Design an enzyme around this catalytic site. Sequence first.
Site, PDB file in Angstrom:
ATOM      1  N   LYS A  14      -7.288  31.509  13.146  1.00 32.49           N
ATOM      2  CA  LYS A  14      -7.777  30.333  12.408  1.00 32.49           C
ATOM      3  C   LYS A  14      -9.166  29.890  12.887  1.00 32.49           C
ATOM      4  CE  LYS A  14      -3.331  28.956  11.038  1.00 32.49           C
ATOM      5  NZ  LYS A  14      -2.886  28.985   9.610  1.00 32.49           N
ATOM      6  N   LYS A  22      -4.571  21.384  -0.554  1.00 34.01           N
ATOM      7  CA  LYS A  22      -4.347  19.951  -0.382  1.00 34.01           C
ATOM      8  C   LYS A  22      -5.681  19.201  -0.312  1.00 34.01           C
ATOM      9  CE  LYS A  22      -0.349  21.151   2.496  1.00 34.01           C
ATOM     10  NZ  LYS A  22       0.206  21.046   3.880  1.00 34.01           N
ATOM     11  N   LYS A  65      -4.475  22.358  11.223  1.00 38.85           N
ATOM     12  CA  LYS A  65      -3.547  23.483  11.044  1.00 38.85           C
ATOM     13  C   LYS A  65      -3.125  23.963  12.433  1.00 38.85           C
ATOM     14  CE  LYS A  65      -7.129  25.948   9.113  1.00 38.85           C
ATOM     15  NZ  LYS A  65      -6.445  25.903   7.793  1.00 38.85           N
ATOM     16  N   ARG A  66      -2.144  24.858  12.491  1.00 37.30           N
ATOM     17  CA  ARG A  66      -1.697  25.421  13.775  1.00 37.30           C
ATOM     18  C   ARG A  66      -2.875  25.988  14.565  1.00 37.30           C
ATOM     19  NH1 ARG A  66       0.184  29.802  11.910  1.00 37.30           N
ATOM     20  NH2 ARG A  66       0.652  30.659  13.983  1.00 37.30           N
ATOM     21  N   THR A  98      -2.373  26.840   2.604  1.00 40.49           N
ATOM     22  CA  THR A  98      -1.973  25.834   1.612  1.00 40.49           C
ATOM     23  C   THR A  98      -2.670  24.521   1.899  1.00 40.49           C
ATOM     24  OG1 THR A  98       0.042  25.342   2.871  1.00 40.49           O
ATOM     25  CG2 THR A  98       0.282  26.770   0.944  1.00 40.49           C
ATOM     26  N   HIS A 141       4.749  37.012   4.157  1.00 39.16           N
ATOM     27  CA  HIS A 141       3.903  35.876   4.500  1.00 39.16           C
ATOM     28  C   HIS A 141       2.754  36.169   5.467  1.00 39.16           C
ATOM     29  CE1 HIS A 141       6.082  32.523   2.516  1.00 39.16           C
ATOM     30  NE2 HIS A 141       7.138  33.303   2.673  1.00 39.16           N
TER      31      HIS A 141
HETATM   32  O1  LIG Z   1       2.896  31.461   2.632  1.00 40.31           O
HETATM   33  C1  LIG Z   1       2.840  30.281   3.458  1.00 40.31           C
HETATM   34  C2  LIG Z   1       1.929  30.501   4.679  1.00 40.31           C
HETATM   35  C3  LIG Z   1       2.613  31.451   5.677  1.00 40.31           C
HETATM   36  N1  LIG Z   1       1.749  31.670   6.880  1.00 40.31           N
HETATM   37  C4  LIG Z   1       0.410  32.235   6.548  1.00 40.31           C
HETATM   38  C5  LIG Z   1      -0.337  31.311   5.549  1.00 40.31           C
HETATM   39  O2  LIG Z   1      -1.559  31.929   5.138  1.00 40.31           O
HETATM   40  C6  LIG Z   1       0.522  31.034   4.299  1.00 40.31           C
HETATM   41  O3  LIG Z   1      -0.168  30.104   3.444  1.00 40.31           O
END
Ligand SMILES: OC[C@H]1CNC[C@@H](O)[C@@H]1O
EC number: 2.4.1.1
Lengths: 807, 807
Positions: free
Chosen positions: A545, A651, A539-540, A647, A348
């Site tokens: 980011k 959305k 997002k976080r 993700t 991931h």
């Molecule tokens: O795969 C799920 C998510 C895990 N953390 C990094 C993200 O880019 C990813 O979408």
Amino acid sequence: ISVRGLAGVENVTELKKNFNRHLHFTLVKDRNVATPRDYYFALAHTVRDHLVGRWIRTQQHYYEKDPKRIYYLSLEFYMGRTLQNTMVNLALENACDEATYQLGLDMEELEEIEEDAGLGNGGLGRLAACFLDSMATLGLAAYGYGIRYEFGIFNQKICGGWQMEEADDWLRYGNPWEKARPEFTLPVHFYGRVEHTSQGAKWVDTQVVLAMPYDTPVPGYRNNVVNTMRLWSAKAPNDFNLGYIQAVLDRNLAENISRVLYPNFFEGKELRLKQEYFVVAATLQDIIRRFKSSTNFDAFPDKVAIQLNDTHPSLAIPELMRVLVDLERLDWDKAWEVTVKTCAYTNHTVLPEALERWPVHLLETLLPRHLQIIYEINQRFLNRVAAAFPGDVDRLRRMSLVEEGAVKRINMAHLCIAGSHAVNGVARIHSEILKKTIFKDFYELEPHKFQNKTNGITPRRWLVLCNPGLAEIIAERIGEEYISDLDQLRKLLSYVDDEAFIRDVAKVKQENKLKFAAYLEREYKVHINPNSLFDVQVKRIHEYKRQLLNCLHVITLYNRIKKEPNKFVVPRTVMIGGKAAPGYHMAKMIIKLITAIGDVVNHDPVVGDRLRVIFLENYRVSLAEKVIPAADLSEQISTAGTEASGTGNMKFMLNGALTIGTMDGANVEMAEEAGEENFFIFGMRVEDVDRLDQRGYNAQEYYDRIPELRQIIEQLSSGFFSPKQPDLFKDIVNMLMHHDRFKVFADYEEYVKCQERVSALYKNPREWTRMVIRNIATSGKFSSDRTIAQYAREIWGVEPSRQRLPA
Amino acid sequence: ISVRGLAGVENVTELKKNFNRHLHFTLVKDRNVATPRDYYFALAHTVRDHLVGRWIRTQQHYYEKDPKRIYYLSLEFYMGRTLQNTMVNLALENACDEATYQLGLDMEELEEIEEDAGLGNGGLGRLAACFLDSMATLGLAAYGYGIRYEFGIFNQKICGGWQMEEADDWLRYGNPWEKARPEFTLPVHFYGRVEHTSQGAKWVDTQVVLAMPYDTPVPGYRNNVVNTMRLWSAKAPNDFNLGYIQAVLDRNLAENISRVLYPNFFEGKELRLKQEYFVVAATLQDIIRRFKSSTNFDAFPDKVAIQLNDTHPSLAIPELMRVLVDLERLDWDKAWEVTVKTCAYTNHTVLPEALERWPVHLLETLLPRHLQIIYEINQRFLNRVAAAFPGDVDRLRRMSLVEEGAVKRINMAHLCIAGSHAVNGVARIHSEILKKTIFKDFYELEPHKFQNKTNGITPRRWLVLCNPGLAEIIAERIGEEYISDLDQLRKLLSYVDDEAFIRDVAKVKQENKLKFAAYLEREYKVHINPNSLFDVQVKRIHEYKRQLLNCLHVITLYNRIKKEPNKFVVPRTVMIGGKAAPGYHMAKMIIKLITAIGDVVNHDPVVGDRLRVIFLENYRVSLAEKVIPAADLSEQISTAGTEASGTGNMKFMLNGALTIGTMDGANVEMAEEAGEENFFIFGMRVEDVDRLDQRGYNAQEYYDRIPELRQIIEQLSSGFFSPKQPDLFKDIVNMLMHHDRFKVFADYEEYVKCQERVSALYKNPREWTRMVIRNIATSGKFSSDRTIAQYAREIWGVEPSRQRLPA
Ligand SMILES: OC[C@H]1CNC[C@@H](O)[C@@H]1O
Ligand SMILES: OC[C@H]1CNC[C@@H](O)[C@@H]1O
């Protein structure tokens, strides 16, 4: 009434009387004393009743048919609310809406009472949640296994512009969706020592913790399939520590295992390791139990697939070996063949500080048998590397599961690759990076292992549920089939010049924005202009980011307004939201900066309502469902090569926002699908980043050559946004100038210029909307149904099915 | 079928379908996978449904009628199982029996699956449980308030003859009877400091613990009244301690308050004090809330009675003062008048080491405002003593709530007397002792305060429920009215010469004994002769209860058999059961001694089946319901003046056992009711004990003059009952010879001789049974309905009612 099913007279009548039954008998309330919460619970129980019949029949069906079972192991499942999702998947939404209306209740009001199940941090946990939905929808015999945390992700409070954390006591009022299964409690062992005897090793003098399962139903979309999510809770055995009082009080120690979800930089804490082993050990016993009711373990991989979501459940590999070798007395090589064939690993991230490397001395104490097994795995694996690449001594040290140094560590990702028949990244660019760089050596040894499975999102929660208005206007033109076959949205391409459709798309967006504008004033007393461009980054909070790059653009706009106040600018509401990890000082500073800019911008009389900066407090799934349909612009601006997939991006695409983004993660495939002309791509590509690292990144260069940037830095340094604490943001400035791993300044110019292009397009509503239609129309690939179909066929060796089970 | 109600066709059909509903929807089970536990739970939920309608209507009825409310505060409620009791009080027993039989299930089997609610230690907690039953049966608006302990009294395991304690995890499988009321959570404050300001004192900088109520229904006997038992559970506030992880884990500290019931010698531990304040603070807020929905507190005592069960909730007095003075701003004297008029205190013992005396420095830290209030109460109280008895300086120090010495202590019993309008003992002899000795000074100051309320037991649980066979043969002759009017049993006197009745009484006893003999072999693999006299002593293991005097008799019998083996003796099964407190070394030694005697006696070939010694493991309410109906002889042999009342004694009397006892506690009134000729009274009276203490008790004297006693002591000392550890019982011998506070030797001779009288009567079945009938026939006084009627009229100022509420 809509795409929300039929409201039959028979059904509405039956729902009303079961509602009243539950309020009376289940809640022990009369109508004169009932609060809206009681009404929520009464509705929840009524809807839950419709699940159980199908739930029991589904699990009975698997027992008879005995298909291959898929076990998805994750330490995070970010489920959100369950009520509406259950209604949607059961086709009960209009019926319940009617039935509640007739009892004199607003269903939307009751829906807001439900607590988010926040058993995840962000993308990883939400992915697991979308995946469960898709697996049930595609008729797979799949089980989600994890931990029932009693405290999920913290509630974020903003106080004086600072993040405060608050325990998320989500179980306070109870959880109507779960079913405790105390009867299926299993033991899990910790500590102890290894004895070697006549016939093999024995793990002895262990401490026992009990794992108690709680089952939650996972309904497929309108197929009467209801799968299971099983979450383990830690319980102390009854002879635990057994003055008397303390022995009883010390039971808390064992039960701390399932107390709290760890927030998102790798910290090697003992309790985290215990959580990791706890889920793995209990789950595998359940897996094996169910297989024995199907002993020749040769068929094990024909009946069992285990998917390791990240390295968190990596101990599944040596645990499975332990059980097969020590308990079932299989020979090492047969056991290993079974293990590799049943396990698969999903990576991931590429951020090195996220990689799990456990100190040997910890595993030594906690899991001494598992350490021995890991060393043996390493030895046999390295013998294979040595034979394939003779004399290549540095490869041997690079590929080793054991890292030497100050402390010896186990690399859990190397363990996962060795013990799995498949390793996948989560977007094409990420999976390529894995083979080219981080796991290059492993790919050279076993090229066949490495795959890609681009992430997706569920169109049920992320269209039908959160944007019924858009779902309906789409259904009018092309029907309802697209809900479980999102590729059908392509058919919307023939409506890009349809004046009626253009008007409707734009109308739905406006309703969404007005609805959200109202929510902001109602729940947080903050005022916004609903005619402005809704510019959103949710997002976080992380340096990669680049919420900070957004902050630089915002300040640029403000400074341009103050320089030419009577000049026309496209009005914007810039909304930023997300949680910072409690220990992450820099992330906490970024939040303070965002609010600090808002403090200046939102009260400048000259600005007017042309620019507004809002920090979205307590970002979570339920809030995502509100803001995403209201967004015009989706900010997806990570440094190229840092965001594995994303993700949230998908959305926004599905919900009628245009995307400003770098060529990173799934943005690449998104832009490829829609056409680059229909995306706002800017900034360095991965190769430009590599080039910059080779020469050496010098932030000063950008500061020297870009006057508008220099002004912002000097504003930050001098205390423009912090009059009482002039040096408040010294850490941020210093990092940007000297220690910025993510090259904020390097993308500043192209970002600002690309933002001008966005604003110019927004001045032309017709052409904005036609581009929007072009985005929605090509979002089909990013359905998790597609993602899961690919896992099923290319990894698990099973065939999805849209065939309905009998009601 | 019996006194167990009607099994109507309509009702049986309806019960069956609701059973199946619950198994399906509530338990989420099919018949093919259901265990007997699932069936128990399905029955429990079906019966529970019949409560709620009446429960809601009862509480609504109190709101409209607004009667005086009775609040019974206890830290212990020893409830036992609920299923059968609920069926009995609802007249559902035969109907459920039929309905389960038709589903192919044995109801008795399902009943055994239910866990005891063991939220008490013994007599005090069981009294509270009987009282709740009687208060609902007599139609009083009464509430039981206490703590929902997550661990009740420990499960006792006997290992190698030694007691082992095991956590009683009674909530593991869930509790279908309770209803969580998270919506009615209240804050409780600890620590902090007192600020004095313009208008009075203020308690500040406190730590907050949340009190979450759980409501359990309490059904009256066939009157459709369902009252509430509310038990508080401790919860940490959401900003508690708010690295991040530890803050969340440290929530356990606050929640430890309701974790475990303290076992039965006064230990001044902080957590116990916290438990005591926790129940009091949350309860009083609830009391006041409910009164304000009825502000002139002059009427408070007209609408509220608070009964303090022992000194455990004594902090109610200064807490009520605190609320009235500090928060409602009433003047001290008015507040005090209200407090005294609303509170009443029940004393439960005369043993000095049981008296609660809290160290001042503890109260100083934990409850600083309450300490100030206590000092003020003391000052004003002592001013009144001084005026009534001028110059009597020693009275002043004797009566003070503050005890000086090494550590300063607060005497909680003195607090209770000062702040209550009524103080009662629990049997006539005990209440007289209170006025003559321990509280003589207080009685002289305020003679009107002091009352008696002889304890009772509920005839529902302790006859109908546990001995249906006896209930039925009684019903045949005199009808069913006696169940709620136990005085009617007197009518059985005219059947003492009835040959049919004599035969039936004796038959029921034999069935009971055979049933219990079977249980012993089934559940514990131990063999007994069901034709022997069942000689039973069941109660907490304490030196004052003199299980050791029983042990001396048992050994005497064994030694007499070994001396004259071919001589005839009435065969006996001597059964002893009860838990020892974990820290009580001597009590633990007595248990070991009992098992040790059994080890010798039960395997002596010469003895045969003429004598058997059995230790009854894990004595509790559910076990009491089994052994009591099987008993022939009830051992009630405390040293005269030590057992305040006893209640076990009354249970045995009602169930057809004859009583061997001292003139102690309620034995005096029991023998008075039946006639002394129908009791086996022996030993010193209270006055003989006083005489012996004045001369000085010399155990050696008895050892010297009684050869049979000397032999037993020498057997114990030399290792006769402990061959491997000859000195095992040195502590017991030493205590008996030199440090016996309870004069075991002084009653030995009369006890042994009285036991011979028992045996002689047992040789004549007809005359034994006629005496038994004479006992059962006069047990009416010892119904808790009588006890509660007396509290209601003489203390609380309310009238009981047998009037049914509409179904
Ligand atoms: O795969 C799920 C998510 C895990 N953390 C990094 C993200 O880019 C990813 O979408
Ligand atoms: O009042 C209930 C019980 C309290 N403990 C001492 C016993 O004598 C009494 O019956």
